[PDB]
Design a protein around this ligand. Structure first.
Ligand SMILES: CCCCCC(=O)N[C@@H](CCO)C(=O)O
Length: 275
């Protein structure tokens, strides 16, 4: 049973899905033009059965309302503010955070705002300074869509297929089509204007465990670049790659992805802590 409910926040009304797991909490943050519903395999599977999985919809996405103030909310740092507010309302200060793509960038911004975070896993996310975008991401037509306000029906399909990968389901179109397109345009411009913290520096200096897990065949992330990024505390000492998966290994290869996520949560929450 997934517990769905909505929170009135300063950013607007935020939809939240929670599993019924009694264990330590895991915040899962979805990507650009997605929603927390994308994390069905974790919410409804072994991860969500054990751990308290929380999968909200960002402002402008899914079942959340559009942002009260797009100029405040639609940016990596603005979304980080919104998710921090959500966690405060839920009374949870020490979640492990999993961020998918845009969600991973948001998670990086959350490090400063959510100091008791027990770990951060990023998938589909190259930590990059603004000038490093070409190094961290692969060039292509779906990539251009990341910052494009208006999607035709065909842009909806191309974007959904490239970002969500196999298997494609019609329900994915509904999610992408709903997205407030202003959020794409504004977030992308602000990323390029360096309005938030330098993500390269943030992850280099961050002391909490950061896990990096990607599909080998994703169309967006430069995996070699990611494997060279400096992290303060890289979980298991390397970046991890799942064969036969693209941008969304949590749905494309759930068992393999869940092995990493479960082990990371265990490591971050159930080992004796020494500074
Ligand atoms: C080039 C800037 C990318 C910003 C983050 C983003 O939109 N990530 C997408 C993946 C890239 O299309 C996602 O959340 O899936």
């Amino acid at each position: 049973t997934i517990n769905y409910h909505e929170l009135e926040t300063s950013h607007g009304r935020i939809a939240v899905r929670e599993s019924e797991g009694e264990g330590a909490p895991l915040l899962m943050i979805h990507g650009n033009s997605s929603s927390g519903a994308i994390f069905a395999p974790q919410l409804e599977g072994e991860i969500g059965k054990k751990w308290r999985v929380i999968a909200p919809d960002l402002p402008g996405h899914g079942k959340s309302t559009d942002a009260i103030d797009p100029d405040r909310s639609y940016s990596m740092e603005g979304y980080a503010d919104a998710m921090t507010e959500v966690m405060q309302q839920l009374g949870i200060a020490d979640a492990v955070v999993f961020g998918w793509s845009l969600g991973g960038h948001i998670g990086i911004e959350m490090i400063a705002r959510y100091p008791e975070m027990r770990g951060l896993m990023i998938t589909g996310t190259p930590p990059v300074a603004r000038e490093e975008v070409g190094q961290g991401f692969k060039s292509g037509p779906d990539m251009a869509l990341a910052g494009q306000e208006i999607f035709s029906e065909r842009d909806v399909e191309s974007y959904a297929r490239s970002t969500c990968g196999e298997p494609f389901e019609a329900s994915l179109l509904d999610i992408v089509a709903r997205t407030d397109g202003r959020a794409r345009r504004i977030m992308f411009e602000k990323f390029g204007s360096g309005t938030g913290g330098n993500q390269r520096d943030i992850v280099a200096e961050a002391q909490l465990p950061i896990a990096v897990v990607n599909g080998r065949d994703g169309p967006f992330v430069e995996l070699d670049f990611v494997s060279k990024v400096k992290f303060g505390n890289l979980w298991e000492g390397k970046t991890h790659v799942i064969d036969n998966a693209g941008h969304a290994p949590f749905r494309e290869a759930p068992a393999e992805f869940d092995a990493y996520l479960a082990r990371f949560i265990r490591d971050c929450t159930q080992l004796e802590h020494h500074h």
